[PDB]
């Protein structure tokens, strides 16, 4: 019953972060300190909407 709405493949295009896990771990603390605001907005949206399709931006 009903049709599952999925975003187009164009909606899922973004410049990916192409570094491995060691590089991310080395800079994890400064990355958390500096990039806190967008990350916390995204996580609040993710835990409130409960839908991946509502949190793409």
């Amino acid at each position: 019953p009903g049709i599952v709405e999925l975003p187009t493949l164009e909606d899922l295009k973004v410049q990916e972060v192409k570094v491995s896990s060691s590089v991310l771990k080395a800079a994890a603390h400064h990355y958390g300190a500096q990039c806190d605001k967008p990350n916390k907005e995204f996580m609040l949206c993710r835990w409130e909407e409960k839908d991946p399709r509502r949190c793409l931006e």
Binding site: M43, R46, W47, K50, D51, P52
Partner: protein
């Protein structure tokens, strides 16, 4: 003499019979009504009777669950 010292008048038995008949008729009507009410309550489940337990909703945990989608 026998009637005076051993028995009462007809009206006593007459009215006692009336009271007894009223009580018995009320009881019969109540029994029929109770059977019908029991049938309706057991069929529908919308009355105080035949209430079978469901899970208490106070047991549900409403917290973030390490995963955004519950």
């Amino acid at each position: 003499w026998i009637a005076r010292t051993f028995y009462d008048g007809p009206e006593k038995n007459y009215e006692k019979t009336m009271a007894i008949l009223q009580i018995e008729a009320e009881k019969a009507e109540l029994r029929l009504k109770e059977l019908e009410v029991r049938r309706l309550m057991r069929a529908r489940g919308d009355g105080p009777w035949y209430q079978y337990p469901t899970i208490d909703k106070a047991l549900i945990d409403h917290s973030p669950k390490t995963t955004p989608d519950n």
